[PDB]
C-alpha cells in the first residue's frame, strides 16, 4: 500500500469510491466499523444513482445462496458472490473479495444518502451468514501484504488509511485503549464528565449493554439512564436556559440569528496500563449540530449499546489496531471551526478509584 495516496480518499455519512468487477463499476461505499459485510445495491431503488450489475461483470461468481441482515430500524437481503475489487486511491492492484448484492431492503436506502453500499470493517464474528464469510479487510490484509491495522479521520471529506497510520493526520500523541471483545470494536468506558463534573453512575452503566466505536452510527448514542444523566448535567451547566425537552429528545431544533454557554463532554478510557486512563473531550460545536441557524442535539438514547458514533469520531484520528487488540485516539488537526479546536485529548489520570474492570 501507499498511505500518502489514501489521504482525502473519503467524501460526504462518509464514503469511499470503489471499483467492482471487470470492466470496473464505480460505487460509493459507506465506511462502517460497526458491521462486517461488504454489501452493495444490486437493483435500481429509490434514493440511489447507481448499483452493481453482476450481469455486467465478467469476473463475478455467484455462491448460489442469499443473505439477510436485520438491524433495529431495518434490514436487507442480497445474493452472495465474489468478485475483483480495486481501491483507486491506495492500491494499484485488485483483490478477490466476497460481496452481497442487495435485491430487497426494508428501510435501508433512505432519502438524501449518497452511498450505495456498505463496507463493514469489524470482525469476522459479526459477518453474515456466518463468520466464515471472509470479511473485506481480512481479504485485503492477506492479499495486499498490509499490516492488520486501519485508521480513520473524518473532517465535518476525510481519510481511511488501510494498513497503517498516516503521520500527517494528527499532532500530539496517540492514546491506546484495549479492545475488550473482538466483535464490534468494544472498549472500556470508565467515566463520563460534563463541564468538568463527573456523573455519579456506577461505571458498569457505561458498558452495560456495551461501548463500541462505530463509524456507521451518526450520533453519540447512550443508554437511557446514562442519557438522562447527561441531559440533566448539560441543562444544569449551561449559562442560560436555552433548550426545550423537545431539543433533548431530537424532536426540536434550537435557533439563533451562541457557544460559550455550553459545557465540554469528556469520555474516560482505560489505557493499556490499567492503572491509567485518558480522556477524549468534545466541545459543544461537535454535539450542538448545525442543520437564523438551527441546531440538532448530537446525542440520542439507546436501548442496545453505548455507541461512539461520528458526533465523536469527527474530533479524532481513530486507529483500529486489530493486530495489537487496541483502538487508538489522537486529536484531529482538521477538527476546527472559527480558529478553535472542537475536541481535545488528555492524560494520564489515575484509575485507582474506579473498579479494575467496568464491563459486566
Amino acid at each position, epitope marked *: 500500500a501507499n498511505f500518502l495516496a489514501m489521504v482525502d480518499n473519503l467524501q460526504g455519512g462518509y464514503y469511499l469510491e470503489m471499483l467492482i468487477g471487470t470492466p470496473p463499476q464505480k460505487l460509493q461505499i459507506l465506511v462502517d466499523t460497526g458491521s462486517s459485510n461488504f454489501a452493495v445495491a444490486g437493483t435500481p431503488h429509490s434514493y440511489i444513482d447507481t448499483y452493481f450489475d453482476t450481469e455486467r461483470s465478467s469476473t463475478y461468481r455467484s455462491k448460489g*445462496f442469499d443473505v439477510t441482515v436485520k438491524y433495529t430500524q431495518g434490514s436487507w437481503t442480497g445474493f452472495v458472490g465474489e468478485d475483483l475489487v480495486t481501491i483507486p486511491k491506495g492500491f494499484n492492484t485488485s483483490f*478477490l473479495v466476497n460481496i452481497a448484492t442487495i435485491f430487497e431492503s426494508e428501510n435501508f436506502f433512505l432519502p438524501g444518502i449518497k452511498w450505495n453500499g456498505i463496507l463493514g470493517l469489524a470482525y469476522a464474528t459479526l459477518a453474515k451468514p456466518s463468520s466464515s464469510l*471472509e470479511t473485506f479487510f481480512d481479504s485485503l490484509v492477506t492479499q495486499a501484504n498490509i499490516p492488520n491495522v486501519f485508521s480513520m479521520q473524518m473532517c465535518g471529506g476525510g481519510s481511511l488509511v488501510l494498513g497503517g497510520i498516516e503521520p500527517s493526520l494528527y499532532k500530539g500523541d496517540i492514546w491506546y485503549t484495549p479492545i475488550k471483545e473482538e466483535w464490534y470494536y468494544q472498549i472500556e468506558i470508565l467515566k463520563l464528565e460534563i463541564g468538568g463534573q463527573s456523573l455519579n453512575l456506577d461505571c458498569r452503566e457505561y458498558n452495560a449493554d456495551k461501548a463500541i466505536v462505530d463509524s456507521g452510527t451518526t450520533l453519540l448514542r447512550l443508554p437511557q439512564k446514562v442519557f438522562d444523566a447527561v441531559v440533566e448535567a448539560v441543562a444544569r451547566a449551561s449559562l442560560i436556559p436555552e433548550f426545550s425537552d423537545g431539543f433533548w429528545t431530537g424532536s426540536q431544533l434550537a435557533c439563533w440569528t451562541p457557544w460559550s454557554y455550553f459545557p465540554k463532554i469528556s469520555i474516560y478510557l482505560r489505557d493499556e496500563n490499567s492503572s491509567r486512563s485518558f480522556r477524549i473531550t468534545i466541545l459543544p460545536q461537535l454535539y450542538i449540530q448545525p442543520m437564523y441557524e438551527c441546531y440538532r442535539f448530537g446525542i440520542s438514547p439507546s436501548t442496545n449499546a453505548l455507541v461512539i458514533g461520528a458526533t465523536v469520531m469527527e474530533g479524532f484520528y481513530v486507529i483500529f489496531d486489530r493486530a495489537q487488540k487496541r483502538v487508538g485516539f489522537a486529536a484531529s488537526p482538521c477538527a476546527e471551526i472559527a480558529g478553535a479546536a472542537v475536541s481535545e485529548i488528555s492524560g494520564p489520570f489515575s484509575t485507582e478509584d474506579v473498579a479494575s474492570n467496568c464491563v459486566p
Partner: nanobody
Amino acid sequence: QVQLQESGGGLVQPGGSLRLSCAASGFTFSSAIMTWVRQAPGKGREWVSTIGSDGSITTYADSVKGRFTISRDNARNTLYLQMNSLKPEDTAVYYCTSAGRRGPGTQVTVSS
C-alpha cells in the same frame, strides 16, 4: 473449525518442485475463497496466490506467476499449490488461510 492443515513441504534443490495440500474442515469449503501465503524468518509475510470458491478465478503474486498453480478439490475439501522451478528465494513456511484463520503451515526449503 475453521480448521486448516498444510502438508507437502520438504527440502528441495533449485529448479525442483513440490505439491502442497491444505486439508480444511469445520466450515463449508466449497463456499470459501482460499489463499496461500508465505513467510521466511526475518522477512514480512508475502501473499502467494488466491482462488475463488468455484476455482475459476485465480490470482498470483508477480514473484510466482508462471511457476506456481493454485487449485482446489471442493469434494475433497482440499486446497493445492503446485510449485515448479523452485529457487532459493522461495524458502518459507507456506500457510493456507481463509476468513482470518490460518493452518500451522508447511516448510519449504530450496537449496544446494
